[PDB]
Structure formats: structure tokens, C-alpha cells
Amino acid sequence: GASRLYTLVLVLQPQRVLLGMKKRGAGAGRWNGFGGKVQEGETIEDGARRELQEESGLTVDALHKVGQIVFEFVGEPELMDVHVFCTDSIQGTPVESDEMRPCWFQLDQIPFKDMWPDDSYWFPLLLQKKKFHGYFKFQGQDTILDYTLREVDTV
Ligand SMILES: Nc1nc2ncccc2[nH]1
């Protein structure tokens, strides 16, 4: 249907959240959660666990579905269908790699100015343990043309 599955994992603990600064490629220069494309024959949740490991070095125990966000970029045919998960139970220490620099942020110091602009809209919901369905239409990397965002009981 001209949509591609992605995952996004937020390691969200009671007073802090882990974010990674991407060194190059999609989302370079921004703090973001950990995720990527889902593979053939892989469940979305299994893909989320794999991407968390690949990008942050962390092994997640329990993962919970928190949202689904569809991203449209004008002029690009494929919609990004992003399945968002959160966890507080992880193992390992975050690893800085060529591709990603990890840092913990206190919740009142989340660096929204250095994040994708849609984050400002749906992070308030994530932090209050709400679940959501969102859609954001972007022109380029920086401008939200329009959006919808609603809370839901089931993702
Ligand atoms: N956290 C996050 N926000 C995003 N917005 C647009 C594309 C990818 C994104 N990842």
C-alpha cells in the first residue's frame, strides 16, 4: 500500500530517557530513539528488539507497544509506518559507535530543538503512559505541513 514498516524504541525510565545522536544518514544530527526497517519474515516486535541492540548495544527484556505514527514526505512515494515501543527493563550499558552517540536525558531536559519536530507533539503522551495514533505530513526534514494525533486504548 506504499507504506514501509519501521520500529522506534524509547528506553524510558522513571526520571530519564535514553536518546541517540545519529552520526549520518536518516535523522543525522538529531537525537532519536532506536529503530529501523522490519525484515522479511520478522515480527515487528522482534525487529524492534533487534534494532535496539544494533543501534544502542542494549538488550531489552519487556517491550510495550505505545503508538503508531505514519510519516509522509511530500514527493516521496513511500509512507513510513512507524511502530513505537517503550521499555524500562534493559540489560547492558549503552554503547557509542561510529553511527550513534547515546546519552541519558532527565525528562524535563529532553532536547526537542535537536529532535525531529513531531517529537514535541507525541512525547507528552509517551511520558504520561498514553498510547496514540499519529500522522505527520512533512515538507523536507524540518516543516510539518499538517498532522493528526489522537490517544487510543489499543495501538
Ligand atoms: N523520533 C522520530 N520522529 C520522526 N519524525 C519523522 C521521521 C522519523 C522520526 N523519528
UniProtKB/Swiss-Prot annotation:
Effect of changing D153A: reported as: Enhances 2-oxo-dATPase and 8-oxo-dGTPase activities and increases thermolability
Q: Which domain of life is it from?
A: Eukaryota
What result is annotated for mutating E54G?
Answer: Loss of activity
Regarding tissue, the record states: Widely expressed with highest expression in thymus, testis, embryo and proliferating blood lymphocytes.
Q: SUPFAM superfamilies recorded for this chain? A: Nudix (SSF55811)
Residues annotated as binding N(6)-methyl-AMP are: T7, K22, W116, P117, D118, D119
Q: How is it modified after translation?
A: The N-terminus is blocked.
The record gives the effect of mutating W116Y as: Enhances 2-oxo-dATPase activity and greatly reduces 8-oxo-dGTPase activity
Q: Where do the annotations place Mg(2+) 2 binding?
A: E51, E54
Keywords, A to Z, come to: Cytoplasm, Hydrolase, Magnesium, Metal-binding, Mitochondrion, Nucleus, RNA-binding, Transit peptide
Q: Which residues bind O(6)-methyl-dGMP?
A: T7, K22, N32, W116, P117, D118, D119
**What does the cofactor field's note say?**
Binds 2 Mg(2+) ion per subunit.
Instruction: Give this protein's Gene Ontology molecular function annotations.
Output: 2-hydroxy-ATP hydrolase activity; 2-hydroxy-dATP hydrolase activity; 8-oxo-7,8-dihydrodeoxyguanosine triphosphate pyrophosphatase activity; 8-oxo-7,8-dihydroguanosine triphosphate pyrophosphatase activity; ATP diphosphatase activity; dATP diphosphatase activity; hydrolase activity, acting on acid anhydrides, in phosphorus-containing anhydrides; metal ion binding
Residues binding Mg(2+) 1: G35, E55, E99
Which Pfam families does the entry mention?
NUDIX (PF00293)
The record places the motif (Nudix box) at 36-57
- What result is annotated for mutating D118 to A/N? Loss of 2-oxo-dATPase activity, reduces 8-oxo-dGTPase activity
Function recorded in the entry:
Oxidized purine nucleoside triphosphate hydrolase which is a prominent sanitizer of the oxidized nucleotide pool. Catalyzes the hydrolysis of 2-oxo-dATP (2-hydroxy-dATP) into 2-oxo-dAMP. Also has a significant hydrolase activity toward 2-oxo-ATP, 8-oxo-dGTP and 8-oxo-dATP. Through the hydrolysis of oxidized purine nucleoside triphosphates, prevents their incorporation into DNA and the subsequent transversions A:T to C:G and G:C to T:A. Also catalyzes the hydrolysis of methylated purine nucleoside triphosphate preventing their integration into DNA.
The entry's protein name is Oxidized purine nucleoside triphosphate hydrolase
